[PDB]
């Protein structure tokens, strides 16, 4: 039902946390 923020940066979180449980150094490595 178009949520205020509360289910938006939650969800736009989870895959940053993701991206950043698995990010790569910047020369590859």
């Not at 039902?1 to 698995?22: D, F, K, T």
């Amino acid at each position: 039902r178009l949520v205020p923020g509360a289910a938006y940066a939650l969800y736009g979180v989870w895959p940053l946390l993701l991206l950043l449980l698995a990010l790569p150094p910047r020369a590859y490595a």
